[PDB]
Symmetry: D2
Subunit: 260 residues, 4 copies
């Protein structure tokens, strides 16, 4: 018999990378509310302290670690520390990332490479670090935060689009290579999500008009819109969903757009 318990993360441990604020924090918060124990990392103590205080305020006892996602030795040590202090990571969400907006021909090789390293190579490093214990546990979930840029390009975001396109295919590869070992690796592809940074574009705006017209749902998304889909992909309720990119965009990728 089906049970709604299939969506529950009770007794599972989730690592959400870079989950000190923003989308990662919202996903980790939903995970805790679904029953999970939350672990997270970020690049410095200041960010970790910020995440810890915010989890506490939401009634969550998270476990926070200082670690650079591009540092394999660092991540390996972090996983080992998490396993001794908290337990086996059942669920990994590759959320950490950066974006840069530079015309392609103006972007330095170093800058391009840095975006690739953080947004693509690092999810490989963290996945590699968690998979062996997931196999031994008999079940694992890896959720890669992709983008609409996993599908569509735009001026100024060449490196970001390249890395997210790579992350989409990395997702499908891990699914193929480890699905047999009961690892489900999927993507979440958020639409246009209203963050603190895009707030002036909503001032009582042509950019706001642009987004609303592109979106059948006729609104910006919010971090809260990602919570249900994220919990779904982390849960037993999605055990036969594998190598799939779940777009959460209010219908953008399905829509030609609202024409005048």
């Amino acid at each position: 018999q089906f049970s709604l318990d299939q969506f529950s993360l009770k007794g599972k441990i989730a690592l959400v990378t870079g989950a000190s604020y923003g989308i990662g924090f919202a996903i980790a918060s939903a995970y805790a509310k679904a029953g999970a124990t939350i672990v997270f990392n970020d690049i410095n103590q200041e960010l970790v302290d910020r995440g810890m205080a915010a989890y506490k305020a939401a009634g969550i006892n998270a476990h926070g670690y200082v670690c650079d996602v591009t540092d394999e030795d660092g991540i390996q040590a972090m996983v080992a520390q998490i396993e001794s202090e908290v337990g086996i990571i059942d669920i990994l969400v590759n959320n950490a990332g950066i974006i840069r907006r530079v015309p392609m021909i103006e972007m330095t090789a170093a800058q391009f490479r840095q975006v690739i390293d953080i947004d693509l190579n690092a999810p490989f490093i963290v996945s590699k670090a968690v998979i062996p214990s997931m196999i031994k546990k008999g079940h694992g979930k890896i959720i890669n935060i992709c983008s609409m840029m996993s599908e569509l390009g735009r001026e100024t975001v060449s490196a970001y689009a390249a890395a997210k396109g790579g992350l989409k295919m990395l997702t499908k590869n891990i699914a193929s290579e480890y699905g047999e070992a009961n690892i489900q690796c999927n993507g979440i592809g958020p639409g246009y999500i209203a963050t603190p940074q895009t707030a002036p574009l909503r001032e009582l705006h042509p950019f706001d008009q642009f987004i609303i017209a592109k979106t059948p749902a006729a609104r910006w998304g919010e971090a809260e819109d990602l919570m249900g889909p994220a919990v779904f992909l982390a849960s037993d309720a999605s055990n036969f969903v594998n190598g799939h990119i779940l777009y959460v965009d209010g219908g953008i990728l399905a829509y030609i757009g609202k024409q005048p």
Copy 2:
């Protein structure tokens, strides 16, 4: 605050077309277990009686109706009857369909047209019949049962593939046209699902070997694998998922295949 209640269908009414047995019955059963009131139709009383007895045995008081999905007048009358006797349909699953396996050049125009009428035109008819009350209710869900044939072709299944390809795009269109009115229209694309009919292909088999090799998960799917994804798409937990085809295939569509 996120809550697992977002996955609950409590107090909602779901119509699952052709849900007397098989995949539709399994989805409707999960819906009931998630809190929904179940209504379903099929082409004759014998099938309806079969579904009713099976729902009863599972502790579900379903409401069953005799109706041909290709009969617009019939479906319109059925919805009106459902609304007077049960209530407003919150969730429609377009599950009813047929398959034929005929080499294309050997298939009659009439046979091709019949597969198109049932598998494509009928989901349009039923969607059209439920959408006006969903808009007035302030929320609706339409879940279209697609296929891997919404993506990939195969000898002998030209009509079926054409209709399911159409259903994929119908899904994206409804999402675009009605998303503004808070209708989420999505697809479920099952992988290779083990039905009563494919049982001899699992006899202690080259076809069995074929499927397992194509599937990262290394097994046939089962109707039970569709239950969580179906409940997800019918629930508040997927409100910003729209015009999306959710493939539930253990990783098939993501995999090049297991080579020797």
Copy 3:
């Protein structure tokens, strides 16, 4: 050794359905210029006479036939007539189609069905009618005119989107079922193409602004933009391209759009 002769259609016969004017006429004209003998059909003598006069003015001796693409008996007889009078059809372009713009819930079941019959069932009928002689000839090409609506939905075009989505999958199915017999079946998916009908939307316009912003190439497409891709798919130069939808859209489907 590769030769540019691989793009030549010299000594081949092409049937382009509904090619009396518009996109089909432009494709057929390019085919003739590439060396092909052109045959075409349309629903009445007036349209056939129009196409014939226009081919003549362009220095092309086309062969025109009155036939409804939804009439299997009619199409069968037409192919037989073409084979006796002109020769074996080497290349079929399924170009004939209609579009309707009606809100979905307002569209009659009859109207929806008519769009499906012409835009989806008819390409099946014509393909079926030409394939047996292509197999016997040792090579065939079928080019299905799809749309951006084979990928993306829009208010008012539910039936059209459904049929073109179906046509995309029909294309992939024929490729799979007949590729072994050296039939290559592909799609052409035009972007926004400037037709006589959209001319007021280019008056010295917000709709014009909409299109240009969606298109990396920063212009409407023209029928002429389809000529090279169409000749490519009809030629020996694309013999290992099969079940593929070739989008000719200046970059629309690849682009998130020009934001303000």
Copy 4:
């Protein structure tokens, strides 16, 4: 009036990276036969000498340069040298690449990063180096050699799949960012192509059986199958094709497979 001259590369210069042998050499050879002047690079003099001798034997006066594609300074200098000695690069084919086959959890971070650097970062570097002169010339083409791994994953090829997935999206981004400047950036996605290396898998074989069954065309592809599609994408005949991945796979990506 359409002309077959639209497929001609007469008076154009093409740079094909790593085109000393294999797929790149075959594409460059077709380009020369289509009228182009051929320039190419490779990592050492031995490979350059090999390519030069092979071009000469085919009646082609190619221009060969020693350069590492991951060396931005090196590539920049190479382009400058090409422009002084040969002329402006009209067409870039990003063909250079490597593949590694290592289980993901066994692959070193350094090895993963090297595959990404060569197969993804390097196409960015070379594209960046050629685009400014293409803009000034008033027309440019960039053709990225992708893979079926731009779409589908497989055990042992995680890094390769990630890089090719990235290259697919880089292609779409360049299309979006530079399409306005009359740059068409597209992909070629070869299917299973019979190379010297896979020859024992064709010995009079289960792997051979695997490929043939996956392929509607019922054969391995050959480098020659890529020549027409490559010339197409480099030519005026594809000017409104942009951000598109042209799969040349005999129908593989369209096919569910030949079941027993």
